[PDB]
Amino acid sequence: SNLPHEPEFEQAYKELASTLENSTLFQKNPEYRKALAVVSVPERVIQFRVVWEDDAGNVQVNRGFRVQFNSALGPYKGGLRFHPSVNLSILKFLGFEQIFKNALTGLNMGGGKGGSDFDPKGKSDNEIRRFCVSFMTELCKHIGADTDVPAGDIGVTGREVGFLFGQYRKIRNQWEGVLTGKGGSWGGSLIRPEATGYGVVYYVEHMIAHATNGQESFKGKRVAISGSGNVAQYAALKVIELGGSVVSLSDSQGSLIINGEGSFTPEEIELIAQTKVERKQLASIVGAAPFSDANKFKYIAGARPWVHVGKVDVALPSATQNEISGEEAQVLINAGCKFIAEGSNMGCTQEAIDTFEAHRTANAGAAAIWYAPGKAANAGGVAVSGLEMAQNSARLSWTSEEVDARLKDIMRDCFKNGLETAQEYATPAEGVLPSLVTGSNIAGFTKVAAAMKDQGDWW
Amino acid sequence: SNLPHEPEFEQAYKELASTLENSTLFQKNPEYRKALAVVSVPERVIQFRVVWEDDAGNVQVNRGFRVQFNSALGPYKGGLRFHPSVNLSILKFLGFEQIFKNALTGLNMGGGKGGSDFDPKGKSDNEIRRFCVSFMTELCKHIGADTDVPAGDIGVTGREVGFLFGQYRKIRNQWEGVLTGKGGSWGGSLIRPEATGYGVVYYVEHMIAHATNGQESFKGKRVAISGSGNVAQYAALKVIELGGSVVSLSDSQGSLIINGEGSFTPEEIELIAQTKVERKQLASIVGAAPFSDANKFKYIAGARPWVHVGKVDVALPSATQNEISGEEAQVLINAGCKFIAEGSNMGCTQEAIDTFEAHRTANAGAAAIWYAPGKAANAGGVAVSGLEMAQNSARLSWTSEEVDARLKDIMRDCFKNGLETAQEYATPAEGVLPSLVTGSNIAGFTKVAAAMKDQGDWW
Amino acid sequence: SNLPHEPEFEQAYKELASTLENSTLFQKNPEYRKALAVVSVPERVIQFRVVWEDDAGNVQVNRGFRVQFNSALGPYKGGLRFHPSVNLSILKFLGFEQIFKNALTGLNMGGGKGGSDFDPKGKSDNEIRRFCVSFMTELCKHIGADTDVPAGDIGVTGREVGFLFGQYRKIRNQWEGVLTGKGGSWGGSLIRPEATGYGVVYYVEHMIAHATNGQESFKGKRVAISGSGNVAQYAALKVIELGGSVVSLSDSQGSLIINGEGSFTPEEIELIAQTKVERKQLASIVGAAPFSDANKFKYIAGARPWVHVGKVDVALPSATQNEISGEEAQVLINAGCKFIAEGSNMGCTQEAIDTFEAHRTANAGAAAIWYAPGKAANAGGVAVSGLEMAQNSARLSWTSEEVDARLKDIMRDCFKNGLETAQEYATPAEGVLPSLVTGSNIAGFTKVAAAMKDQGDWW
Numbered sequence A, B, C: 001s002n003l004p005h006e007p008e009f010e011q012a013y014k015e016l017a018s019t020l021e022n023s024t025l026f027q028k029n030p031e032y033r034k035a036l037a038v039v040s041v042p043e044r045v046i047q048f049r050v051v052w053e054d055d056a057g058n059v060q061v062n063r064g065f066r067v068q069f070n071s072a073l074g075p076y077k078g079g080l081r082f083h084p085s086v087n088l089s090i091l092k093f094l095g096f097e098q099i100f101k102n103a104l105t106g107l108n109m110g111g112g113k114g115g116s117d118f119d120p121k122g123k124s125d126n127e128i129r130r131f132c133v134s135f136m137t138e139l140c141k142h143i144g145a146d147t148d149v150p151a152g153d154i155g156v157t158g159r160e161v162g163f164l165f166g167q168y169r170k171i172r173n174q175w176e177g178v179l180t181g182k183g184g185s186w187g188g189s190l191i192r193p194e195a196t197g198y199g200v201v202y203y204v205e206h207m208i209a210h211a212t213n214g215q216e217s218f219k220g221k222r223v224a225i226s227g228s229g230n231v232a233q234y235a236a237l238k239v240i241e242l243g244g245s246v247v248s249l250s251d252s253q254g255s256l257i258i259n260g261e262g263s264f265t266p267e268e269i270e271l272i273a274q275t276k277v278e279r280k281q282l283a284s285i286v287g288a289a290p291f292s293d294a295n296k297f298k299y300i301a302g303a304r305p306w307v308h309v310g311k312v313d314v315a316l317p318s319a320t321q322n323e324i325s326g327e328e329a330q331v332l333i334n335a336g337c338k339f340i341a342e343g344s345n346m347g348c349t350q351e352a353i354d355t356f357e358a359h360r361t362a363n364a365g366a367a368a369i370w371y372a373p374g375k376a377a378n379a380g381g382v383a384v385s386g387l388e389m390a391q392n393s394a395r396l397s398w399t400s401e402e403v404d405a406r407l408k409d410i411m412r413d414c415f416k417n418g419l420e421t422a423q424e425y426a427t428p429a430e431g432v433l434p435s436l437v438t439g440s441n442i443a444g445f446t447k448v449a450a451a452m453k454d455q456g457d458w459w
């Protein structure tokens, strides 16, 4: 070996491997242990220096990455993250998860992830442009419409996708679906901005219907959300549309929580959206209307929302990895939370997951908190990216209604697959909800493992 | 010149050329003689050494080929054959036929064929993997989704397609529709396994309806099939579904014939399918149930089925070229056979064809045996390969019902084209069935010849 | 950031940076601090999975790497290491050093390094072949005669270069100087096998002449060598040719030391060379003649040679990084060692270097132990690799005498450059030997930094 310490990647791997072991999978297919050893080493990783010029004319250096983890099911597919935390460990955890998430969409997409330790905060739009130009000058050699199709993630919006696309087209002299999250007039898809957040809510709708035998829905439920970017914004919007209340949003500096009964409104979400476009914090808008209304809003510096929202019915962590601790998980259970789905990749700590899963095993039916992993619940974004690829390959643009209908079908099938797979391989006690994390992991892994075997990646 | 002796290719060429001469085609378009001279020389042929390692660690050498015969109508398209007989002559006959077959599908596909003298019999799956890896290491330079799209044929199943695809993706670093016959989760098409055999039966349904003025169908007919691989299996299944009886299957070592009235069943076909997956002979399963039941089954070592089935209504040779001799053709006529369609490429000897065509000319209406050439009747496989390409380019997967409906329409149009073209250019005597071989040949040739002229390949 | 822990890389970086700071370089050119920040992040790194088949038919997985550190002065250039320790940290230290080493040769070569955690020990030649085939199947995309030219290093001999070259030629369909260390009939260079070890000895000849005002040479000196592979073998041979005594060799399991006065002979070195070709340990040949002669040889299991050789005049660590500890450095000083040059990359620990450099500063003239860094002393290998590239580009083969003459000139110029640069930028006290480590580091760094500035890599 001897291998570097990659805690985030190791966490993701261990949770997958644990769920596979705690099932009948390896009794039925013990040869899949070999598949697991092979799939866990990325097919290819590219790391590269990115030199770029700041607004003062000074040289700056950052590190760029693209992890091309697995391509059995399709070209590598997954986002780009621009955040100062970024390193290979983080991108490997993300790319690894992406393989199995993509498998659950039913579309032909392999798994990858990339990005940079470039921090968009405090940069001008001009600085972001120059950075994206330099970044893509190297990345374009390694990607392409039938090769690897990136998109956004934390710190990468349609703005950055644009600058990246422009430079790709300039060097490669091809106009194609090399990126998704593109602008509406230059190959974007309707519903792509909404897709991840909408999908998370669609998925939880199925969880609620199943756990409650159709007796409950989002109507009248209180939903605590974290983050305030793309996933959080549209998850919030969909909750509101379905008659639920959104009782929190947050960012890296603090939480903005509804004080009492009430909800964010669509108009408030749009103000927050514009603030985040400008790369400003929630803290910067709580001094003026509407967010200075202390009757409606409480801003809590340095906090996550989970312990401050009081009673809640659904939690949708939608910011970043490891944002629900073991202690926070218990608080949510004590607050009456019965549904927790990850908008963020690896949003729950392992302690949180263990807490939720023990609770499910101990409490029959609708008394349990039911946990859905990000690879199932947040797959709507990448699914609609696949549809953007489909549109670009067709050279046509579909309607909002057409894309949204497909998104709904994909989320329904993903839920059913996880539910039915857990019922088959990890059969719960009578009256106990099946494990959606175990089911989703087995369903995604087996699809990839079998395609790998067919293609001679292992034998 | 001076040109090598290529008997199979010369046979295919001479039969095409003869049908074109025995028509009014060259009275109307004498310049098409030039097209015939040009189209008959392949655009490109690649031959290459394939070195591979056996399970004992020893070097082995085989010969690889890809004949890229014509691309006027589309990228080169056709299968790969792994059989010890393979040489350039055989692959040229196959690739030549493929040009005109592909033309009759209505899809944009040129004609090609390839393969190796590698013999899968007696090899382990590991040996087949290593062979496919080495084979594609060279072939990948020459093929691609808009260039040349291979598939299976004799000795190449989904297993080999998988190993080939994996190695292509590894070297070329593109995930695309470079092969067809792919697995369901990695870009395959529903109905592709069924397509060739289903199509042959769909085509003969039209022949029966026409010859009998709608009075007869497959219902109650006895159907003698040869081979026991992909084409034979699904032709048998479709016959059974339509209420016909399948009275024979065969392989290279002997024939397995129904003893009396009766049929293979779907369950028996599946047992035979699994035996052939394991590369075992029919001879190896006749010692145990159900095939050891001598009341139902008679295994005849060294024989073809045609003279041993007694009375039959339809014959579908579905194994290999030149598998119905002139004497066998007469026996089938004496046995009451009224429909003969080639599942196999060039399944009938020239003596057989001449016998069938003389019989058609001598016997009005439904009294004639009606012969359909492989380029018409077996075109369903390549047609569904075209639809697999279409699906891969759309980045979506169609339903079984959608693919099957298109397959039915393609086979209907192919029949109508051959029938109507023969009625126009080779008008039969009153009451005599038109020549489907002449009609199909003229219809395919003229479409290619005219596209070639448009593209400046001849003038 | 936040960056992974890469101790080997950090060690190499810190030693370079320290020598640059302890000089007048940044007084004269403070802008070179920017160059240092840019040059220290590799231009590109490729990591890739390598799946290969063992002699039992089982799947095995290893990790492959190529670090393409800097290309200002030429295409990336440096070896491949196959050793179970390999990881990115180790390859970054090696590739970083390579940039500056290559700069000192005077040839147009950038810096890189690659390899795998594949362990050649215990593998058959067939297993090594299959591994190299799989390795190059991915690596060939990233390298080429004007792009990146690998070669051997630990665990990669002409045998592996051959298997790698064969697979490159098969996929890329170009015969070119993509690798060095090639075989004599297929583009190799005479003197390349000898070059590294010969060069180390040539370099030390200059050190001895300078320190002793021409009064001493290798004639009559006792030379302790570590390792027993390519560098150690030919360093030993050259010492013997010059009338010196080689008093030790070693491998990863122990040291083989001359017992008393005496030397390894060329015939003994050839026996050891054949043992290492077979990937066997020194321990396996000490039970038979000649090495079982306890009067001449003492095998010491688990030891390095430095404390067991008694009095010595020159030490040439030629095995691996960090193989002379601080305590061993003091023992060598106490044993009368006056010259220490690294055959191995980063052979001395930082404690050893500090000890040697303090001794030089404290002891005038020939009383000092004089330390030469690997980037100066071991540059003969890569220099002759450059000449192999030159020969391949000329399409001609030079004589042994021609290559060796150029090698001698390159080593002389490298010594003079390090000596003169230290005299200019880090002027020692009267009578004190200039620092060859400081001089070599400044000379290599400034050449790269200035070329980078010219090319717009920093400003």
Ligand SMILES: NC(=O)C1=CN([C@@H]2O[C@H](COP(=O)(O)OP(=O)(O)OC[C@H]3O[C@@H](n4cnc5c(N)ncnc54)[C@H](OP(=O)(O)O)[C@@H]3O)[C@@H](O)[C@H]2O)C=CC1
Pocket: A083, A085, A152, A153, A154, A155, A156, A196, A227, A228, A229, A230, A231, A232, A250, A251, A252, A253, A281, A318, A319, A320, A321, A343, A344, A345, A378, A379, A381, A382
């Ligand atoms: N966009 C998509 O389609 C997909 C995204 N995801 C995942 O959803 C999550 C959110 O992504 P997305 O909305 O697109 O990204 P955005 O950059 O639009 O928003 C990220 C939000 O999370 C906060 N955040 C980011 N890093 C941290 C951190 N280290 N600590 C605390 N808060 C943090 C951000 O606050 P601040 O501005 O203060 O840093 C911001 O409010 C991620 O886990 C992402 O991988 C899941 C599938 C699809």
Ligand SMILES: NC(=O)C1=CN([C@@H]2O[C@H](COP(=O)(O)OP(=O)(O)OC[C@H]3O[C@@H](n4cnc5c(N)ncnc54)[C@H](OP(=O)(O)O)[C@@H]3O)[C@@H](O)[C@H]2O)C=CC1
Pocket: B083, B085, B152, B153, B154, B155, B156, B196, B227, B228, B229, B230, B231, B232, B250, B251, B252, B253, B281, B318, B319, B320, B321, B343, B344, B345, B378, B379, B381, B382
């Ligand atoms: N698969 C497809 O989509 C297409 C195939 N075809 C043609 O259909 C025919 C059958 O192909 P397919 O079913 O796919 O192939 P398979 O390899 O699946 O089956 C071939 C069958 O034919 C037998 N066979 C092969 N060679 C000989 C031979 N020299 N002598 C006697 N019997 C032989 C085989 O027996 P054994 O195992 O003992 O050798 C086996 O039963 C061929 O002519 C093919 O070119 C037509 C269009 C499409």
Ligand SMILES: NC(=O)C1=CN([C@@H]2O[C@H](COP(=O)(O)OP(=O)(O)OC[C@H]3O[C@@H](n4cnc5c(N)ncnc54)[C@H](OP(=O)(O)O)[C@@H]3O)[C@@H](O)[C@H]2O)C=CC1
Pocket: C083, C085, C152, C153, C154, C155, C156, C196, C227, C228, C229, C230, C231, C232, C250, C251, C252, C253, C281, C318, C319, C320, C321, C343, C344, C345, C378, C379, C381, C382
């Ligand atoms: N070959 C070249 O042209 C160049 C090589 N170098 C450097 O010279 C040194 C030797 O390389 P080279 O002779 O080519 O390689 P070889 O593989 O031919 O020999 C390496 C020697 O060092 C021993 N060795 C390797 N790793 C260790 C270890 N972790 N611990 C203890 N002993 C070890 C080996 O013993 P064992 O077999 O028991 O592992 C063997 O005797 C390396 O530092 C290399 O990077 C410098 C410039 C050029």
Ligand SMILES: O=C(O)CCC(=O)C(=O)O
Pocket: A077, A078, A079, A101, A149, A150, A151, A152, A153, A180, A345, A378, A379, A381, A382, A383, A385
């Ligand atoms: O659309 C994509 O490719 C990626 C969406 C995303 O960021 C994710 O799945 O984590």
Ligand SMILES: O=C(O)CCC(=O)C(=O)O
Pocket: B077, B078, B079, B101, B149, B150, B151, B152, B153, B180, B345, B378, B379, B381, B382, B383, B385
């Ligand atoms: O699907 C294909 O490309 C080929 C099918 C086939 O083997 C044939 O038409 O002969």
Ligand SMILES: O=C(O)CCC(=O)C(=O)O
Pocket: C077, C078, C079, C101, C149, C150, C151, C152, C153, C180, C345, C378, C379, C381, C382, C383, C385
């Ligand atoms: O010849 C080469 O490219 C490399 C020689 C080597 O292993 C080194 O300089 O460390």
